[PDB]
Design a protein around this ligand. Structure first.
Ligand SMILES: C=CC1=C(C)/C(=C/C2=[NH+]C(=C\c3[nH]c(/C=C4\NC(=O)[C@@H](C)\C4=C/C)c(C)c3CCC(=O)O)/C(CCC(=O)O)=C2C)NC1=O
Ligand SMILES: C=CC1=C(C)/C(=C/C2=[NH+]C(=C\c3[nH]c(/C=C4\NC(=O)[C@@H](C)\C4=C/C)c(C)c3CCC(=O)O)/C(CCC(=O)O)=C2C)NC1=O
Lengths: 315, 315
């Protein structure tokens, strides 16, 4: 696509349907409000940026967290984290831990590394893996690509309870077609419907080849800024493509609301390094899919990508 | 292979190195002693056979369990179980549940269906899924088949803590070669070693194309008979290939002991319906890998099988 615009917080232009492939969706400087996010120096563990809602989840004010080390804040996790995510590791690699907190359930921690920055996501939480193991039989025995697609969408709907699960296949002109769909009874079918390339613009497609799962938990929820908004290491925006908490493009959020969607999630299907399609999910109401279920969906995405390649080779 | 012999309990001949492809390894009429096994009628749920150690795990004598229904014994699981495993479903499909019991941890239940028979395995129990999600990056980026194999064996060793993990590839003459190995420091290497076809005889290879994971938790542990040994539905032996608790061939157990192996496990690598190889694991001491970790290994096996097919196609 044409080069990204600056984000709105650096004085960038408003997004319209004439320029929307230039929206810098990877650097919104904000997150979805169902979790908290910190960034930290990869070597010292010093906390550099904090979502403004951090006190809700972490029990300290953003301004007080700023500058504290992960050695101090997360003493039991820091050495494991530092060892798990060495300089130069893939930016999609994750360190995951479970933390205790005063509320019901636990606090899930997911960390990844971009350059010299660690990006930490904290998300409250509280059969899928075995369900996936079982589904692999029907995915394997599917005789062809479309049969595979039909199995896959039904499997994902069974795993998640999403109201609608589609397999959305890209054509070479970047238009799409819904080639399989599993949906709650009552819902109008999108099966067989085709859509222009504009709905998933080129910078989104590029991001989705690198970071294979993204979501909008609540399509009416206001984003929460990061502070400071720029990474002090670089005095430049923080890449958030690897964080599921990344704020969704407002353009896409409006699209989803217009479609009657309360929660959205997709998983990339990538074949030979190319974006083949998406497992695209909708719910009618807000829905935060727990981290362990997302992990199952990522694993299914990888499986499905390989099966697509093998079943297409049958032709 | 030549037709199977009758098992020893039906007066079959002793197994030697001259006839060992005829050992009926799928119908040993016995199980490994770290769990219990029941069989039940698929329609009524009546318990038909019981491992002789059942009281250790279930708290009722085999003779008292015999004839009771799963509706009575497992009231909370029976309808789910019956719905999960309908007549004609794949014999590899599993129903899994967690049961409470008086000892520490829980009792894992795994059920599968062969014909009109349900086969129930009960096994005491007490990060892998996410570890597998992470490993998928390195498996995908592996440039070729051997690199993939090296990643896979290291991944499995990381997931399991097994002393030795090999990728054992079958040649068209059914000889094998260790093409990758991850092993604890101190252990002599089998990397690159080749082995005659006799070590994994043709009936074993056939079974391993249908039931993709098997193990011996303790290579010195005596098997526990099923009683009655024949399925009353058929007045014939009960197929146990789908049960991880199935007793291992005594010939193989002796091989493992001679090799200094205390616990063994393998996962089939199946490509286009053909047995390509095994992920073959050893431990120096007895080791019962928990059901959820086995599930992760099954999922890795499926992934790896697909990656083998894709990486081989690069040639
Ligand atoms: C049944 C039909 C159907 C379709 C066609 C569909 C499309 C779709 N769009 C997606 C994403 C984005 N779209 C746009 C931009 C625009 N979209 C427009 O229509 C115009 C107005 C526009 C700009 C002028 C942007 C910037 C993003 C990136 C969002 C981000 O990651 O921050 C996603 C993936 C995310 C997800 O799964 O929820 C999907 C699956 N989902 C459906 O169910
Ligand atoms: C480093 C080298 C190396 C090798 C070569 C190796 C082989 C191997 N044999 C396997 C299984 C069986 N073998 C035999 C029979 C015989 N085997 C023999 O040698 C002669 C004496 C013989 C009969 C005369 C039978 C009936 C079975 C089925 C067991 C069952 O499923 O009940 C397995 C899979 C099971 C597992 O992972 O533990 C493996 C991986 N495992 C290694 O580590």
């Amino acid at each position: 696509p044409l080069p990204f615009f600056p984000p709105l917080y650096l004085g960038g232009p408003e997004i319209t349907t004439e320029n929307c492939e230039r929206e810098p969706i990877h650097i919104p400087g904000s997150i979805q409000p169902h979790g908290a996010l910190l960034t930290a120096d990869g070597h010292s563990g010093e906390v550099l940026q904090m979502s403004l809602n951090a006190a809700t989840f972490l029990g300290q004010e953003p301004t007080v967290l700023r500058g504290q080390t992960l050695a101090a804040l997360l003493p039991e996790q820091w050495p494991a984290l530092q060892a798990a995510l060495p300089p130069g590791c893939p930016d999609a690699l994750q360190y995951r831990a479970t933390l205790d907190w005063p509320a019901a359930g636990h606090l899930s921690l997911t960390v990844h590394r971009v350059g010299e920055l660690l990006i930490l996501e904290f998300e409250p939480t509280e059969t899928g893996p075995h369900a996936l193991r079982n589904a692999m039989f029907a995915l394997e025995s599917a005789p062809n690509l479309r049969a595979l697609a039909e199995v896959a969408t039904q499997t994902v709907r069974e795993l998640t309870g999403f109201d609608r699960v589609m397999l959305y296949k890209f054509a070479p002109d970047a238009t799409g077609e819904v080639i399989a769909e599993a949906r709650r009874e009552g819902l109008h079918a999108f099966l067989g419907h085709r859509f222009p390339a504009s709905h998933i613009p080129a910078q989104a497609r590029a991001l989705y080849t690198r970071h294979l799962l993204r979501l909008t938990a609540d399509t009416r929820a206001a984003a929460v800024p990061l502070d400071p908004v720029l990474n002090p290491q670089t005095n430049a925006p923080t890449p958030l493509g690897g964080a599921v908490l990344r704020a969704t493009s407002p353009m896409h959020m409006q699209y989803l609301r217009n479609m009657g969607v309360g929660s959205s999630l997709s998983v990339s299907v990538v074949v030979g390094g190319q974006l083949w399609g998406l497992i695209a999910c909708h719910h009618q109401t807000p829905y935060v899919l727990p981290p362990d279920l997302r992990t199952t969906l990522e694993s299914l995405g990888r499986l499905l990508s390989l099966q697509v390649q093998v079943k297409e080779a049958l032709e």
